[PDB]
Ligand binder design. Structure first.
Ligand SMILES: Nc1ncnc2c1ncn2[C@@H]1O[C@H](COP(=O)(O)OC(=O)[C@@H](N)Cc2c[nH]c3ccccc23)[C@@H](O)[C@H]1O
Ligand SMILES: COc1ccc(C#N)cc1
Lengths: 323, 333
């Protein structure tokens, strides 16, 4: 099976777009690929934050990924800082990364924020990764990882796999509620544009009620991204939740107003989130289970990472550690 | 418990009399008075591109050199940097508490990027942060180094204070231990330039493993000055060569500069160079005799590395655990 690597930020407030898009896509491919999920706490600290909140956010993220369907017996899930090899390879790869390559990435800035693309390269290359599902903002970072890998391989032989982007997109379409021309993003400052995965039925109703529609007369529930972006977004959200096709929903809402659509979307989404939240709280409140998942995952990750790091260290010429 | 000493040297190039005077000499003398930890910093060495076989051999050359100088593994912890993962781990963490501007303003980064224009890599830039991690891991009180590492030391103090101010008494704020003489031994044909173990012009350098005969010839050919009459007097501005020779003589013999000036009253540069050559030739012959005894004993070198990495890891793991707890990471099971 090809090896797939994904970094999970312990701070990202995930949305229904993240879930019904990429995450649900990947949950159903855990037997097709050897999937690795790395909770990237070492990347998180490039932005200063409260220590207690970071610890909590790491465990929140773990429980949420488990709740979404990431299975720790099928896939490898672990906390980045638990595997020393990440930092070790990161330092080594700094020495095969041009300063220029980092300065070109798209004085009071901390060095972690400057240097984290090299750590990301190490994160990926440690596991002989074949595929990396990246968003547009991470394309440059992936390209650097490929250039580092090829550069190192040209000097020392085929030590790393050259990773590839995972090209196919999920197919689910979730746009911002007050700005339906742009994608619903977990990075949005305006939280009224998004539905978070831990929101209750009342919060979801409130946000869907506010969602931008059009001034068509009569109001008509039809799919048209150009002229009816808001109504189309509501249809896409509903279709993604229920599995009903757009033409099926258009027929279902024949002669109905936008109030009735919004009510059905709210109910459908909250139906989905209530089951996700049950699983989340069950996992999140079981400290023993989470500790076992992290220990097992770090052990699996470490076994693989140590093999790659040993090959790297031998290639570079370091005197082998005496155990 | 005793206060802690930490210092390191790269296994790249070939250690010079400069490296001995500025650092190793002090390392040997501090072993009873403080709890001393000395490191072969192979992860720093790879910031300059080396052949893999050269790197491995140089790591073991450096280890044998420490032993030959008088670094006793029964008194001091001696280890190879890459054998202790905590250096890399803390070095990443400390990147997040170091400003880009602090690194871009470094003299060593600018001198190194000038000399290695075709390999201005991120490791060369990030060098000082790993060095800070090297020191801070061991609750280090004293860092014996040459003058050229003063700026790197200042940063490691700033990082410790900055981190401590946020999180509590996690690190000791280390202090430099720079000797009065021999802190910055200068090149023999270019006494305004520091003596460098990676100098192309070999005649600028006195190698620790160089043939003493070759070293005595280099001393005889060292540039002095046009003073008429010749006068053996300390003046770095107008008498750089003679000053460097006096500084070398002072550092080997332990005699002060005014003592040497009185000693060479009425004498000229032949006397000075004779006495310098004698002192240095004697040191290196002895040093190199001990060296081969250690260097060819692979079982002993293996044991020293094993024991040292064990002792180091115990200290480093303690510090990293406190650092990780303070910043907010979930503790490893
Ligand atoms: N011409 C000279 N005259 C007097 N002293 C000199 C001369 N040239 C070099 N030195 C000193 O020798 C030590 C080793 O040199 P390195 O280049 O390996 O030294 C270096 O490049 C360090 N960054 C290695 C290091 C890495 N981590 C550390 C932590 C603590 C102390 C030192 C380190 C150094 O103390 C250096 O000051
Ligand atoms: C590029 O990632 C890293 C940079 C520096 C260190 C260290 N020490 C570890 C990782």
């Amino acid at each position: 099976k090809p090896i797939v690597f994904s970094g999970a930020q312990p701070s990202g407030e995930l949305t229904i777009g993240n879930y019904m898009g990429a995450l649900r896509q990947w949950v159903n491919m855990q037997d097709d690929y050897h999937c690795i999920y790395c909770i990237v706490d070492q990347h998180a600290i490039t932005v200063r934050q409260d220590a207690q909140k970071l610890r909590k956010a790491t465990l929140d993220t773990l429980a949420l990924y488990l709740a979404c369907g990431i299975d720790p017996e099928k896939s490898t899930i672990f906390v980045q800082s638990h595997v020393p090899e990440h930092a070790q390879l990161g330092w080594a790869l700094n020495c095969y990364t041009y300063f220029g390559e980092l300065s070109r990435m798209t004085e009071n800035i901390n060095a972690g924020l400057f240097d984290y693309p090299v750590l990301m390269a190490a994160d990926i290359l440690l596991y002989q990764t074949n595929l990396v599902p990246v968003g547009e903002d991470q394309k440059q970072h992936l390209e650097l990882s490929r250039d580092i890998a090829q550069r190192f391989n040209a000097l020392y032989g085929e030590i790393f796999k050259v990773p590839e982007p995972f090209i196919p997109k999920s197919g689910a379409r979730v746009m911002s509620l007050l700005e339906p021309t742009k994608k619903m993003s977990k990075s949005d400052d305006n939280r009224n544009n998004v539905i978070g995965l831990l929101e209750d039925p009342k919060s979801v109703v409130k946000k869907i009620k506010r969602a931008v529609t059009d001034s068509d007369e009569p109001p008509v529930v039809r799919y048209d991204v150009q002229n009816k972006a808001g109504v189309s977004n509501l249809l896409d959200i509903l279709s993604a939740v229920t599995g009903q096709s757009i033409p099926e929903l258009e027929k279902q809402f024949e002669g109905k107003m936008y109030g009735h659509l919004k009510g059905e979307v709210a109910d459908a989404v909250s139906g989905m989130l209530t089951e996700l939240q049950e699983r989340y709280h069950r996992f999140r409140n079981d400290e023993a289970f989470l500790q076992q998942v992290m220990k097992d995952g770090a052990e699996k990750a470490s076994a693989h990472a140590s093999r790659t790091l040993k090959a790297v260290y031998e290639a570079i010429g370091f005197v082998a550690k005496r155990h």
